[PDB]
């Protein structure tokens, strides 16, 4: 082509958006923003497809244009604004609050959350650089730059952002024994304790993780998000606890859970 693409076909969309085959040729094509377009959920899919508030891609316009929707505490009037991981969606006309966390199957989830928790979010530190008369900066995975960080914040750690002010409150460092969520790959949405981190200089670090049932897995280092210090998550978790069931016992859960009916 000559210059950038503005459309997204539907079959070429991310798999986790769960758009069906026969509704159209095109998919919502996320706007440029804090998140990669493969790693995000546009606001039109959260309102029309997941929450079933809207029914067409004109009612999402009519909802967002009444300024009823705050994404990380700022009002968003773009329906294809890419909301990504750990983003807080506050709808104040109804009274709900959501956080975008992955579930055990590699998609996002409708995770309703308490407005006492919706005042903060976690971010992962991505590059730390000095400059401009010797003033240090962070860059997180939301492109949030927070100048003057704590000197004990390094790369691959986790900060906790206050969402009304933009400032760091307290952090977690990258160590063994910390509770982490995988945000990419085939182990995506899984929660476990960091066991081990193997270094491959000139290539990617591999971080072996251990479940709460004993299921060990590994990822590359970039798909690792430190959620808690020790084993206590600093955010809430979804209905499943980040623990992937194999399909046999995932069947057993259904064929035993239907027997509570009557």
């Amino acid at each position: 082509a000559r210059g950038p693409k503005k459309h997204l076909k539907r079959v070429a969309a991310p798999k986790h958006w769960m758009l069906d085959k026969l509704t159209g040729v095109f998919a919502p094509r996320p706007s440029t923003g804090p998140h990669k377009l493969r790693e995000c959920l546009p606001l039109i899919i959260f309102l029309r497809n997941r929450l079933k508030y809207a029914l067409t891609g004109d009612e999402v316009k009519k909802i967002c244009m009444q300024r009823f929707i705050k994404i990380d505490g700022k009002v968003r009037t773009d329906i294809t604004y890419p909301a990504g991981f750990m983003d807080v969606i506050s709808i104040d006309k109804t009274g709900e609050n959501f956080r975008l966390i992955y579930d055990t199957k590699g998609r996002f989830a409708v995770h309703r959350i308490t407005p006492e928790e919706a005042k903060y979010k976690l971010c992962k530190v991505r590059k730390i650089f000095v400059g401009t008369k010797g003033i240090p900066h962070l860059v997180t995975h939301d492109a949030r730059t927070i100048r003057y960080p704590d000197p004990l914040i390094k790369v691959n750690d986790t900060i906790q952002i206050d969402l009304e002010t933009g400032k760091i409150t307290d952090f977690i460092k990258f160590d063994t024994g910390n509770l982490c969520m995988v945000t990419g790959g085939a182990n995506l949405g899984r929660i476990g304790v960091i066991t081990n981190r193997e270094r491959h200089p000139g290539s990617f670090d591999v971080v072996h993780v251990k479940d709460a049932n004993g299921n060990s897995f590994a990822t590359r280092l970039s798909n690792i998000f430190v959620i808690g210090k020790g084993n206590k998550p600093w955010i809430s978790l979804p209905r499943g606890k980040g623990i992937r069931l194999t399909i046999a016992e995932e069947r057993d859960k259904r064929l035993a859970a239907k027997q509570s009916s009557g």
Partner: protein
């Protein structure tokens, strides 16, 4: 670009040798016994059996403690018990290979309308289904090759709008009542 799906699938295979006696004879006996219309209704039920034998014959090379054999093999027997072809005590993966065409043809809605006595012949069941006289639990079923599941066998009846079960007479009885 279009929002259409072109995913289709043929549901039968024709034989390699077209004029073979005792293939012709056996399929004609299965056409006459079960009230079917043409050869393609036998070649269709031969094809779903050949898909079930083939998938079990693949699953028999993996060992008994395979993940895939234990999951997908228990889900193959579950369907064959569910439609009433297998029984419940024969749920090893090797009584699949002892299934036949007639086990699958006894579960059509046509032969079940004949078995329950709502018809009086196997060709009387084809018309009584096709004239919309037969319902399954609430729903008028208009297709004779509707494979009746095991739980839906106790609810097969006479379709409350019909002259046979419901009571408002047809086209012919009312005209003869007009000429009375």
């Amino acid at each position: 670009p279009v929002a259409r799906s072109w995913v289709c699938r043929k549901t039968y295979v024709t034989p390699r040798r077209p004029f073979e006696k005792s293939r012709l004879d056996q399929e004609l006996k299965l056409i006459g016994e079960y009230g079917l219309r043409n050869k393609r209704e036998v070649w269709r039920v031969k094809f779903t059996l050949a898909k079930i034998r083939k998938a079990a014959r693949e699953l028999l090379t993996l060992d008994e403690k395979d993940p895939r054999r234990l999951f997908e093999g228990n889900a193959l027997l579950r369907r064959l018990v569910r439609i009433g072809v297998l029984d419940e005590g024969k749920m090893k993966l090797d009584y699949i290979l002892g299934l036949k065409i007639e086990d699958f043809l006894e579960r059509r809605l046509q032969t079940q309308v004949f078995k329950l006595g709502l018809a009086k012949s196997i060709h009387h069941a084809r018309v009584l289904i096709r004239q919309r006289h037969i319902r399954v639990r609430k729903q008028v079923v208009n297709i004779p090759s509707f494979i009746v599941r095991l739980d839906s066998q106790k609810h097969i009846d006479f379709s409350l709008r019909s002259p046979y079960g419901g009571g408002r007479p047809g086209r012919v009885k009312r005209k003869n009542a007009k000429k009375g």
